[PDB]
Amino acid sequence: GYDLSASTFSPDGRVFQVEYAMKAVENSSTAIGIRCKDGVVFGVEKLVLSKLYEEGSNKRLFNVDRHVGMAVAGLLADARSLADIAREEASNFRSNFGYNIPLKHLADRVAMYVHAYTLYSAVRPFGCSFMLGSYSANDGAQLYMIDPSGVSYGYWGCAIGKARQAAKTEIEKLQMKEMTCRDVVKEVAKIIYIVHDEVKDKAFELELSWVGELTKGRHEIVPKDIREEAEKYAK
Amino acid sequence: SRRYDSRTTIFSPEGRLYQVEYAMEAIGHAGTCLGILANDGVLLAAERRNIHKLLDEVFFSEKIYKLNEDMACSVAGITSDANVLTNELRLIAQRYLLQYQEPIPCEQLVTALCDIKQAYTQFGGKRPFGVSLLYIGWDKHYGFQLYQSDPSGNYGGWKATCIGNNSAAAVSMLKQDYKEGEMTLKSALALAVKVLNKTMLSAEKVEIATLTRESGKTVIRVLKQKEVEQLIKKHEEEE
Amino acid sequence: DRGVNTFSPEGRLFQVEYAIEAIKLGSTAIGIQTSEGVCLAVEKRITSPLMEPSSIEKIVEIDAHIGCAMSGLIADAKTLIDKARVETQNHWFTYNETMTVESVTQAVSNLALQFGEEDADPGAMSRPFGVALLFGGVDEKGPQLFHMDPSGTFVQCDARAIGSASEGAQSSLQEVYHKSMTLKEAIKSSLIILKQVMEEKLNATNIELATVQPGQNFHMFTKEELEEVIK
Amino acid sequence: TTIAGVVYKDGIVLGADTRATEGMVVADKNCSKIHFISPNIYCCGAGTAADTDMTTQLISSNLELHSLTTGRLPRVVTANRMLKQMLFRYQGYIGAALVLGGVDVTGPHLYSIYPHGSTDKLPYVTMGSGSLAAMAVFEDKFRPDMEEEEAKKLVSEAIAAGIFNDLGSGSNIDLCVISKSKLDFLRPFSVPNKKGTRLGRYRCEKGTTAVLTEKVTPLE
Amino acid sequence: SIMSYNGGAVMAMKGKNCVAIAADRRFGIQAQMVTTDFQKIFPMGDRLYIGLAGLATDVQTVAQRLKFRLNLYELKEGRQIKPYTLMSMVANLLYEKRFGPYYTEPVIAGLDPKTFKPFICSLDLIGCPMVTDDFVVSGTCSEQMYGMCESLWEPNMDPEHLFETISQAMLNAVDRDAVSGMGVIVHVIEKDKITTRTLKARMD
Amino acid sequence: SYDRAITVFSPDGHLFQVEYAQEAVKKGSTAVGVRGKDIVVLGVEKKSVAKLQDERTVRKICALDDNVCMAFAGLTADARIVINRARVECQSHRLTVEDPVTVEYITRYIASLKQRYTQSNGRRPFGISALIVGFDFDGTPRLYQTDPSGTYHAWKANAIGRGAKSVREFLEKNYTDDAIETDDLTIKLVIKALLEVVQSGGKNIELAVMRRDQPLKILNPEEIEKYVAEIE
Amino acid sequence: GSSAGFDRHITIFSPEGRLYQVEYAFKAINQGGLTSVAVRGKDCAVIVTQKKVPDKLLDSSTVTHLFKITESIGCVMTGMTADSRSQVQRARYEAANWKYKYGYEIPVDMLCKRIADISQVYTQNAEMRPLGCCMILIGIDEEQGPQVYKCDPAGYYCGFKATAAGVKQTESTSFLEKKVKKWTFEQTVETAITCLSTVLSIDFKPSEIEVGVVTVENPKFRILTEAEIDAHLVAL
Amino acid sequence: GYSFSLTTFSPSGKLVQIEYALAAVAGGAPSVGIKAANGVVLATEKKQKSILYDERSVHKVEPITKHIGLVYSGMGPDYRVLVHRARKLAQQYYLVYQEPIPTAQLVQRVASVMQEYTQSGGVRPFGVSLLICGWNEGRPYLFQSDPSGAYFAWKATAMGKNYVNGKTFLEKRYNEDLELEDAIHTAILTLKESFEGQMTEDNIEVGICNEAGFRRLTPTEVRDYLAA
Amino acid sequence: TTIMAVQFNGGVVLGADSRTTTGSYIANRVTDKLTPIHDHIFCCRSGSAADTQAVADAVTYQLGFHSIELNEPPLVHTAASLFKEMCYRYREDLMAGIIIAGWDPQEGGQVYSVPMGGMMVRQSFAIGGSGSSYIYGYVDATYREGMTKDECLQFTANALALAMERDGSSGGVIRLAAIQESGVERQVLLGDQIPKFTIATL
Secondary structure, three states: OOOOOOOOOOOOOOOHHHHHHHHOOOOOOOOEEOOOEEEEHHHHHHHOOOOOOOOOOOOOOOEOOOOEEEEEEEEEHHHHHHHHHHHHHHHHHHHHOOOOHHHHHHHHHHHHHHHHHHHHHOOOOOOEEEEEEEEEEEOOEEEEOOOOOOOEEEEEEEEOOOHHHHHHHHOOOHHHHOOOOOHHHHHHHHHHHHOOOOOOEEEEEEEEEEEEOOOOOEEEOOOOOHHHHHHHHOO | OOOOOOOOOOOOOOOHHHHHHHHHHHHHOOOEEEEOOOOOEEEEEEEEEOOOOOOOOOOOOOOOEEEOEEEEEEEEEOOHHHHHHHHHHHHHHHHHHHHOOOOOOOOHHHHHHHHHHHOOOOEEEOOOOOOOEEEEEEEEEOEEEEEEEEOOOOOOOOOOEEEEOOOHHHHHHHHHHOOOOOOOOHHHHHHHHHHHHHOOOOOEEEEEEEEEEOOOOOEEEEOOOOHEEEEEEEHHOOO | OOOOOOOEEEEEEEHHHHHHOOOOOOOOEEEEEEEOOEEEEEOOOOOOOEOOHHHOOOOEEOOOOOOEEEEEHHHHHHHHHHHHHHHHHHHHHHOOOOOOHHHHHHHHHHHOOOOOOOOOOOOOOOOOOOOEEEEEEEOOOOEEEEEEEOOOOEOOOOEEEEEEOHHHHHHHHHOOOOOOOOOOHHHHHHHHHHOOOOOOOOOOEEEEEEEEOOOOOOOOOOOHHHHHHHH | EEEEEEEOOEEEEEEOOEEEEEEEEEEEEEEOEEEEEEOEEEEEEEEEEHHHHHHHHHHHHHHHHHHHHOOOOOOOOHHHHHHHHHHOOOOOOOOOEEEEEEEOOOEEEEEEOOOOOEEEEEEEEEEEEHHHHHHHHHHHHOOOOOHHHHHHHHHHHHHHHHHOOOOOOOOOEEEEEEEOOOEEEEEEEEEEOOOOOOOOOOOOOOOOOOOEEEEEEEOO | OOOOOOOOOEEEEEEOOOOOEEEEEEEEEEEEEEEEOOEEEEEEOOOOEEEEEOOHHHHHHHHHHHHHHHHHHHHHHOOOOOHHHHHHHHHHHHHHOOOOOEEEEEEEEOOOOOOOOOEEOOOOOOOEEEEEOOOOEEEEEHHHHHHHHHOOOOOOOHHHHHHHHHHHHHHHHHHHHHOOOOEEEEEEEOOOOOEEEOOOOOOO | OOOOOOOOOOOOOOOOHHHHHHHHOOOOOOOEEOOOOOOEEEEEEOOOOOOOHHHHHHHEEEEEEOOOEEEEEEOOHHHHHHHHHHHHHHHHHHHHOOOOOOHHHHHHHHHHHHHOOOOOOOOOOOEEEEEEEOOOOOOOOEEEEOOOOOEEEOOOOEOOOOHHHHHHHHOOOOOOOOOOOOOOOHHHHHHHHOOOOOOOOOOOOOEEEEEOOOOOEEEOOOHHHHHEEEEE | OOOOOOOOOOOOOOOOOHHHHHHHHOOOOOOOOOOEEEEOOOOOEEEEEEEOOOOOOHHHHHHHOOOOOOOHHHHHEEEOOOHHHHHHHHHHHHHHHHHHHHHOOOHHHHHHHHHHHHHHHHEEOEOOOOOEEEEEEEEOOOOHHHHHHHEOOOOOOOEEEEEEEEEEOOHHHHHHHHHOOOOOOHHHHHHHHHHHHHHHHHOOOOOEEEEEEEEEEOOOOEEOHHHHHHHHOOOO | OOOOOOOOOOOOOOOHHHHHHHHHHHHHOOOEEEEEEEEEEEEEOOOOOOEEEOOOOOOOEEEEEOEEEEEEOOHHHHHHHHHHHHHHHHHHHHHHOOOOHHHHHHHHHHHHHHHHHHOOOOOOOOOOOEEEEOOOOOOOOEEEEOOOOOOOEEEEEEEEOOHHHHHHHHHHHOOOOOOOHHHHHHHHHHHOOOOOOOOOOOEEEEEEOOOOEEEEEOHHHHHHHHOO | OOOOOOEEEOOOOEEEEOOOEEEEEEEOOOOOOOEEEEOOOEEEEOOOOOHHHHHHHHHHHHHHHHHHHOOOOHHHHHHHHHHHHHHHHOOOOOOOOOEEEEOOOOOEEEEEEEEEOOOOOOOEEEEHHHHHHHHHHHHHHOOOOOOOOOHHHHHHHHHHHHHHOOOOOOOEEEEEEEEEEEEEEEEEOOOOOOOOOOOOOO
């Protein structure tokens, strides 16, 4: 009974309740993030589990701030609550210091808030991972990823979910450092199509988001035209 | 939180509170505390457990505590728990004296502490106090009195009573030796020595306090080493 | 062991389910709604002959136009009954008008699931109320009979029976009931059914009866009145 | 009240008068205004006597706790910080004008703390009802890096100026020399005021007072 | 003034190996006398007494609260409280109501429980202690008490001489004050006895 | 603060804690009550008859007010808490309303408290049963009985404790309108019911009485010995 | 040993008087797979640590175990990553709070004590678990010189001449023992790098390890660059 | 946090948690307290046995006030909490009575805090036995407060590992009229009856208490006392 | 009290008086009204000595903690934002007019004025304190754009001196400061160094 609480270490020094919350992130659809030379591109393989759902329902991409994007994977209910938390930190930061919150500080603040739910039995650890991406003229392009335990690192290419181990390989090939957001859109769109399971899973929709120099440092969803132009190139 | 909770303040199948019952077993192994009420006073006789050659004397008493001007008490069981209760007793007496500008009656003091012990066996989720007390005192309503409370909050007035280790053998030896109404302090002290010798005796192994009245003033005092020693020798003459 | 807000594998709260089993041990209460008014009846279940039959009150007046018959744990009902009384008195104070039977039942139904251990203060229910209620009053929509149970679910019925013999009484209500009954006919049928699901010989001090007509206020039948209806 | 302090060549010299007045009447003729904060830090007090005493008692008790924890010699900035943060939080309700001065690892430090919470770090300060008189002496005779005996002379002159010019100051002159190797608390350091000798003897003879009731209670 | 509402005056004098404490007995609201035997001096030990002047209600309140703390203090650490320690306890008690304090200025007089060295002090309303080696006064006629004390007090006075000095001091001081008088009580604390006498004072 | 639910429902709709609290009442001393014409009698069986015990400090029959008195059975420490709350409520009722409380009013208040401890967090139910007896303003003899669950009933004659089943049975076939004809037959009735359950009946039976417009009286060793000899 | 009740689940004494939960938190320090080493010289303090960075997608400039607490204090965390950042965040707050209240910079030994005091509360309170991380602080004292402190999850702390934490802790202390049994800035840095290298037998490269230092002439804590680390790596 | 008690009564009437906390003290480093007429002496085994550890970094013998010192046996981290509480309890007493807290008063206040952890919710008892020494009113004081909250007055007592054999030897060497200097030799002699290797100047910590206040001896001082 | 801050290419130039008075008595004649918030961020203080000292202390504690977490040199605008927040939040109690001035790599030399109410306005130069009223017309007719670091030092000293001679609450010595990418250049202008201006005589 060492894995019934988050405030209990196991005999070999492990917190099983935190590892069980990361198991729920592995059942989710794969979400990938790629930071190019002037921005970050997000791509989720939104699985439509019903034909009655409206095209765009249960979106796994949010806007935590004007210059910050957030790609999630795992429990949608939990991810939405974390998105609200990230929106507050960014909002509070602007009121206090008078300027946009740096992505590294936002990642730090939220990761520490996620780490607080993995210490006691009074609550349970979050069951969802998420990537934060933003672009600044002075800061550049940043891409962080926070897991259920609270660990957050900076990345160049990242993937979380069902086939995150297979989507990662197809991301190392690309030279994002010297690439561009416009060209990366298709690359990311193709990666999501290759790793998507069509023999076990059903049908899915392509969710694409990006922030960079082309969108003037403002995060927004990839336009229909571009979205469909990359959807045909990846098919 | 609901798995580690041992549930100390809940009823059992037979309608008994286990925690309280287990706390009374701890008082049955502690040093013997006896009380004998006379016509001209009341005394307390507790067997000292802190017996060692390297043990210092420092305090004026180890088991007997002065509650206020006219009241003294003897604890039994968890000594650390007794320290919390004796301090509360003094605060209860001081509060009563600050409100009515008069000493608090013996029964009102015992009742206030018994209400606190009762509260730890009903709610709060905490363990009860594993300490039984013996109160001796004098008031203007009932003169000399001898009370005795327990872990559950129960309490009663007695003529002569004993608590702690071997309190059953002492009570039975007190019934056949006590004289209802015709007991003097001197004769009461002799009875205490004959009860402590039976449930056991040196003069360092016991502690005796008496509470008498002198010129409209209560006087509590612990009998001295020599003072007790003589008593012990006089009981040996009758044996 | 589990918490009080623990859901079962089917989809029902254990605590609530267990509280519904405690309502099938109390005395039987019968409610009948007609166009002339609502009539409430309930067996008193007198254990010993030394006990005073009047001390037992299973039918109470919530307001002038609202009555209430209970079943199950009678001590739990007192907490709910007082809330209903204050609720109707507050309504009168604020809107200068009486409260409807449906509104009262709904207000008392909000306390049903208001229990739980964690994240709550000292003055909070630790468990659910183990009692079913039968509200019968007269408002703008005429006579009405609502039924509330331990789960906080309230409905409207023409004739409802609660208690240990509710199952048996229900069948008899469905057989002898139409939507044109008179108040006197409702009362007669109520006593008959109550007299078949009992153990003791139903007399004038063995049961309780009350009606709520559109004209007069909530009235509790007296011994003589009950004795003349038993004829 | 006249309190003053100066920073000499190798230390701090504090000084104050010893008279305590309640209104326009002398209540205490030999009061102590120089309070101990720590072994290397002392404090002079003016303004409300009850506030100055309780405030210095608290800060010194807090510094003693702090000194036990770290195991090092307390600093004057620490004391300065604690006092100013406390006085500012009471919005000047705790009228405690103090002259804090001590010697630590960074040398001798002189501070003047006002009731509202403002503090100043100067080479010489004065406080109290007769602070202007003491300041006049410091403005005409203070020299940087003075000798121990010269600092004691200037401080004595400053305290004396307030004693003979301000009605709220009087009695003796207490001094406190603090250095890196010592702390001389001179109480008193000077007794410039002496009460005239009684010209007659009004000794009350036994039996001059008529008694109505009398009771004797023996003790043990 | 709030402090002169009830009137009153307390005094304390140091002798050779003894101390004396005196006080007026008048209790009254403004210009009207109610009783002539109001207690102002309270025993805080065998040889430790405390006088309280000021608001009559606060005099009883502070005297009752001081006894509450003193009693607990003596029970905790079985020993009689020292004169100087009692002054700190009172100061603490008075400084607790820093903003809205009791209107009483206590005077403490007594001998140490192990050396019997005379001790006298006086505190203000907010608890500012002040130990002296001659005398301490408190009340409405403090100015008159100072005048009498300053010119009559002599160092190293014996019990008999000390009593006369404090008697004449209070007697003449309260006779020049309208809201103080109606009798004087004096407590002369020695090493083996406590003499208490009431003086033949004016009743106007 | 402790906020764990102590009393909860069980599979067959039972409140175990309340049933365990009622089990404690059966192990307690027997206390019978009889409602007479112009008198009310409360008898209790002193289990512990120790000769070294001060009998005045262990009484079971208390007084809530000038017209209301009561006896209990079960945990003595719990009874005291309840009695002290009822005493405070009686003075509160004499403050707000300008009249004495009725016997049913205080019975309803004591029952209300008992029920609250069966539906509150971090607290167990009271393990006692009360036998409230008294007179109203009109001069009517009242006899109510509350239990751990929080349900109260008005009785004519009731017994609570260990031998309550027997006493009740015996009282059922003994309590009539001719058996309580006066103020002596009612006392002889309470003593009779107690004598068929109390070991060595006689000196182990304390009993107080209460007549209309009269405080509470507790018969002593001699008074009760005359009634015990009268029977024979 | 033996077990009773829930001694292995919460921080309560067992039959032998041990805190099993605190023992399990020490085993969680080796679940990161890394190892840090700290060596004290005569005019400096050296902190070196394994910098494992598998995937190339993960930015290596954000994968650091060296944190700046204050301008003069630096530290290296070992164990659970999330717990480590939480502890570092607290240390920065504790240090900034100390300066604000006392007017002077917090000593390294006092910061370590404060952090150890907070860790002891988790060993007593049963509602929360202890942290599975380790902290090592280095800095220059006003009148004591370079310092090296270490506080574990049990709330216990101490001062060291040379200390190590992580998977390779026993061997690291056995090698450092001999080094102190038999030191300039260069000599100290080389000694720490050697200890880590010989204990792992991997011949660390410029971007394979991280180094943090503090000197008497330069108290300001700083992290050596790859080139700077390569300059000391090609001299052994 | 939890609101229930972790330490409860068992069937025999024992508080296992408190008894298990006493086992932690018994496995701790040996401590020695000796009261010898003109002062008290506290000595403790401080074997870090690792060489990298800075001996002067931490301390086992700590001053609670100017006239009171402290020593312990058991858990070090728990001892730091009690030492901080004792220092706070002493300063609080001095702010009210304006006089150093009596050794007996401080021992009661610290024992009250230890008793609170054996009855409060969600907390375990302290795993450290204390040995407090002081000097008030020309008299040496030596107390011992255990995990349960109980405290006793001693003349000479042993703590931690091998305390049962420490008391017997201590009782066979203790004398009523013993001076501090001679008490500092018997305190080290009883500490050397279970010191395994060789006792050095920084291998054991000694604290003495006399009329000049409480002070921790230094390496130089210990060296001289160790030679003799 | 008279404080002034001017900005140029490299950074800024701060200056103030040193007189602390209580009515007509000078409590401190060598007060330092220029407080360093960070390495390149200073602040002039005017108004209440205890209010501005408590506010400057709080900001300094927050800005340093914020600068450590971000691992970056704090922006001047952030320091102004922290002063502004405190001065607005407690505008009823505090009586402080702060001028924040400094240099940062993102915006260079900036001067922010945070007056009594708690508003925050960026200016090329600012003046505060009671003595600033006498020098409004002079800083208007004398200031030109394109001033160098040395020209700002002279212009600031000239203005402070003119105000000190007319204001009863200003006097003492002039404390200047130059902040740049390099660091801070503190300097005092004593008695004879203080710029002099002849008095109209007849």
